[PDB]
Write a protein that holds these residues in place. Structure first.
Motif, PDB file in Angstrom:
ATOM      1  N   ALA A 116       0.920  -1.182  -0.001  1.00 29.61           N
ATOM      2  CA  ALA A 116      -0.154  -0.158  -0.130  1.00 29.61           C
ATOM      3  C   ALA A 116       0.881   1.440  -0.059  1.00 29.61           C
ATOM      4  CB  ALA A 116      -0.960  -0.031   1.455  1.00 29.61           C
ATOM      5  N   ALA A 118       4.045   1.706  -1.069  1.00 30.59           N
ATOM      6  CA  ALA A 118       4.719   1.630  -2.305  1.00 30.59           C
ATOM      7  C   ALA A 118       3.717   1.959  -3.451  1.00 30.59           C
ATOM      8  CB  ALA A 118       5.246   0.224  -2.589  1.00 30.59           C
ATOM      9  N   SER A 119       2.575   1.729  -3.300  1.00 25.79           N
ATOM     10  CA  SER A 119       1.385   1.966  -4.243  1.00 25.79           C
ATOM     11  C   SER A 119       1.196   3.583  -4.257  1.00 25.79           C
ATOM     12  CB  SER A 119       0.103   1.187  -4.381  1.00 25.79           C
ATOM     13  OG  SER A 119      -0.964   1.849  -4.808  1.00 25.79           O
ATOM     14  N   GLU A 122       3.739   6.136  -5.779  1.00 28.70           N
ATOM     15  CA  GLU A 122       3.559   6.391  -7.036  1.00 28.70           C
ATOM     16  C   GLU A 122       3.100   7.680  -7.512  1.00 28.70           C
ATOM     17  OE1 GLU A 122       1.656   3.062  -8.818  1.00 28.70           O
ATOM     18  OE2 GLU A 122       3.511   1.558  -8.204  1.00 28.70           O
ATOM     19  N   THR A 123       1.948   8.140  -6.716  1.00 30.53           N
ATOM     20  CA  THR A 123       0.954   9.321  -7.292  1.00 30.53           C
ATOM     21  C   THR A 123       1.119  10.366  -5.910  1.00 30.53           C
ATOM     22  OG1 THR A 123      -0.920   8.585  -6.281  1.00 30.53           O
ATOM     23  CG2 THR A 123      -0.316   7.872  -8.517  1.00 30.53           C
TER      24      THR A 123
END
Lengths: 403, 408
Positions: A116, A118-119, A122-123
């Motif tokens: 989570a 890491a994800s 990304e943004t």
């Protein structure tokens, strides 16, 4: 009423030859809970919209206060969610993060939580650092490295915004110094996100004392209710952070909340978790029956906590003796789990053989993981097991390792 | 084998007094699905880890193959999720939007989707545009406005990236021109995200022909399985977009691209949805039982869809007539739903009056109907189902007539 150990087995629903040494995965519940679960299903089937719109809410509300009591929390600070991953993610997604904010994790952090983080990276522009923990270790040495991480972050000009803590590491399973880490967090101005997936129903716990910034728990892991069943505790002082469930639904609060008119056929925080996507609530609705069974048949929470700890201490020790190995330990064993090392060094086919053998031949199941160059096994005590069951799995594992 | 209507009631589990005119909300399922469901519960509590680790998988896979065939899709394009909101949000959250991309919605978009788009914009720089849809309209005028919004967006130098379509509007309930809107989306290079929450089980679908960019459905709303039970269709060409479930779990695919721990020893796109947070799977596991009942007891899928559409048409008309009002149409009813206007006009009064109507149906008449305010009036949604007949609809018509009189 009923003595702990195999006298308790008549109150539960397993086949006679089924050793359940890994109960938190699916949960395990008495017959009283099973029969109540099926009466709600009967109700749902007999009059679906009446059961859902009128009868469901008051049982849910009773379950909420029984969980809040067990936590020494206010019912107003406790909401229900489907699982612990959802609760932890809901908190992480709602906290606004800045490129100078740091999220602090540990090498014991649950894998789904790393993914989570890491994800999200990304943004979003925040950054993260992992406090290294190589068990075995001492609780105060863990607490010190955390304080050293927090100090290093502040020295570089960054802001230690949130730390992910756990009560029990999933595997290898020990109890972590979460009471001390929450304190270190409050001293340094770091939000304490506590992953208490393993907690309620396994050992005593008092949030009125601990005062974590966020606390998430899987009721199904140790409260005799079926999976999935989780709860999220957010103190009043932090309830402003949470504006949306995951996934967002009709309870959403914009930064600048409107329920549709069918809502008329409670705070803003509570409405967020009342108007959510279509879901089953019957594990949560089983909480009172479970807590009744624990008060009346098992002699209350403290008795259960003691038996679980004592059985895991003795039963885990006996499995390590029989194996010629050790139990994971630097109290880290102040819980109902024992993680025992297997005499195997590190793979896939072997892991596959071991597990199918336990499931097919011996009618049990154990999680395992590679750690410190060896394969370890997590053993979970529970009130219908006795010390002989551990002696049994010790010999079984002995034979399979030899094989 | 069994004629549709009240002869079907013996095969279902409702109280004899209860009239289910709102089955999609919780789903309704036959006794054979109930019995199979209890048998899984028995197995789960007899052999928890054996049921979960060895026995669940093959049933779930059988269900995926049957859903894929019902949709005319490949198995590897159909994955299971808890509910439609989760599936729609999983797609929205995975798609990388920049600041010059635009997400197109409609007046009819499910409110939970609007909130997700609002939530996501606090953290991502994209913009969104809402096509005005003021029902009743004709479907072709809806398409005309959508195509106009696409051209307007390009006219500003922006990029129409994705459009949220639906098969059936939640409330007020009509069938939208989703086939034409999907076709317009691909002509213009817009990703078509279809909210087909109401679809599978209610009317015929062919994704091999439709070719939507993403298609989300609630199986529990119309396939005779209990809530929650959803599926997500992602064609092969679009699976590179999807790298994580919501919430993320062990199946997560790093943007690098390499996806599991040792206990997993005990398709990448399909793996994303196999390794998820602890959840219940038994609704999805009831799909084979439900579909067999529909073939063997009900005469098959097409026979069910025709009965649902004819009953909703005739039943809906009979409710409108008894009320002296009207059914919502394009002045769109190729489904098993009818939305009927109540002779109640629209303050502080609406809530209490709505609440009295609701509990009077629940407490007194042993039914339940969803309400909405639209166009200055209050509308009700009625759902036909194979154990209902036209007499059930004239009953509710008279009942609703009588209650509206009370409030007025």
């Amino acid at each position: 009423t009923t003595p702990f150990g195999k006298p308790m087995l008549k109150h539960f629903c397993m086949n006679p030859e089924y050793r359940n040494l890994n109960a938190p995965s699916c949960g395990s519940w008495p017959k009283t809970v099973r029969d109540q679960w099926r009466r709600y299903l009967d109700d749902l089937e007999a009059q679906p919209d009446y059961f859902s719109e009128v009868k469901q809410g008051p049982v849910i509300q009773e379950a909420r206060r029984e969980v809040a009591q067990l936590l020494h929390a206010r019912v107003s600070e406790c909401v229900f969610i489907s699982n612990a991953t959802t609760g932890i993610y809901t908190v992480l997604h709602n906290i606004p993060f800045d490129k100078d904010d740091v999220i602090i994790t540990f090498s014991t952090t649950y894998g789904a939580i790393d993914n989570a983080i890491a994800s999200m990276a990304e943004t979003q522009p925040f950054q993260t650092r992992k406090v290294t923990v190589d068990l075995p270790m001492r609780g105060e040495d863990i607490v010190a490295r955390f304080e050293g991480m927090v100090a290093q972050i502040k020295a570089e000009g960054l802001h230690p915004r949130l730390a992910v803590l756990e009560t029990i590491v999933s595997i290898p399973a020990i109890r972590m110094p979460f009471e001390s880490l929450v304190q270190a967090c409050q001293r340094e101005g770091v939000l304490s996100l506590v992953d208490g997936a393993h907690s309620i129903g396994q050992f005593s716990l008092n949030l009125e004392v601990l005062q974590p910034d966020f606390f998430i728990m899987d009721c199904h892991k140790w409260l005799f209710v079926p999976r999935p069943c989780a709860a999220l505790y957010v103190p009043e002082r932090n309830q402003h952070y949470i504006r949306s469930t995951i996934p967002p639904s009709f309870g959403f609060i914009p930064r600048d909340p409107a329920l549709p008119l069918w809502s008329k056929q409670a705070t803003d925080f509570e409405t967020i978790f009342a108007y959510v996507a279509t879901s089953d609530n019957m594990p949560h609705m089983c909480i009172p029956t479970a807590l009744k069974f624990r008060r009346e048949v098992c002699g209350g929470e403290e008795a259960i906590y003691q038996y679980l700890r004592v059985l895991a201490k003795e039963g885990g020790d006996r499995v390590a003796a029989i194996l010629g190995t050790e139990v994971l330990d630097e109290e880290m064993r102040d819980c109902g789990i024992a993680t025992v090392r297997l005499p195997l060094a590190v793979v896939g086919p072997a892991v596959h053989y071991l597990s199918m053998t336990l499931a097919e031949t011996h009618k049990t199941w154990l999680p395992l993981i590679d750690h410190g160059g060896y394969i370890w096994v997590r053993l979970c005590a529970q009130i219908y097991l006795d010390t002989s069951d551990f002696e049994w799995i010790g010999n079984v594992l002995k034979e399979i390792c030899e094989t």
